[PDB]
Ligand binder design. Structure first.
Ligand SMILES: O[C@@]1(CNc2ncnc3[nH]ccc23)CO[C@H]2C[C@@H]1C2
Ligand SMILES: [Cl-]
Length: 167
């Protein structure tokens, strides 16, 4: 039993809710919140820009030190950093950004990072400003993640389409 509330159960381990991941994180304080990161951990917009703003830019400061030490992530890769005031940990995961021409096949690799964590609050990878089809992202999520994932979908119209089209 965990403290996530109001989610529709898609599968044994995947749950979905129309919610602002920032507000969800501030309520639940999950062990792990997933960020829709880019390889540079430049949290300018989308989910990343919103999560960073909620940390008063502390996420960006920590991220810049991480990059200065380790260099960029790989597309499909991840790193674990602090969750600041939002969660214990933030798993920064880089899905392919279609608006950059990155291979959508890397989306499965991106979701595989979730399997290293028993429970996660997460957005759909590569959705929104990363330019992938969110229906496809949900399908890859369900077919790849085996741990318990609670998906927050900000757009209510998108949330309804994801549920009504789910196979
Ligand atoms: O859910 C999407 C990804 N962006 C987010 N998801 C959850 N909480 C969020 N908080 C801020 C941004 C944000 C996927 O497609 C459309 C609907 C949005 C963009
Ligand atoms: Cl977005």
């Amino acid at each position: 039993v965990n403290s996530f509330s109001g989610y529709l159960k898609l599968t044994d381990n995947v749950y979905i809710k129309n919610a602002d991941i920032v507000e969800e994180a501030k309520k639940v304080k999950p062990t792990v919140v997933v960020n829709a990161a880019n390889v540079y951990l430049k949290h300018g917009g989308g989910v990343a820009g919103a999560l960073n703003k909620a940390t008063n830019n502390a996420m960006q400061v920590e991220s810049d030190d991480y990059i200065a030490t380790n260099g960029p992530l790989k597309v499909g890769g991840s790193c674990v950093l602090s969750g600041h005031n939002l969660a214990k940990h933030c798993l920064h995961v880089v899905g392919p950004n279609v608006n950059k021409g990155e291979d959508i096949q890397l989306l499965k690799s991106a979701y595989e990072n979730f399997n290293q964590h028993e429970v996660l609050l997460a957005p759909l990878l590569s959705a929104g400003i990363f330019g992938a089809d969110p229906i496809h992202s949900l399908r890859v999520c369900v077919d790849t993640v085996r741990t318990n994932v609670y998906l927050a979908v900000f757009d209510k119209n998108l949330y309804d389409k994801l549920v009504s089209s789910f196979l």
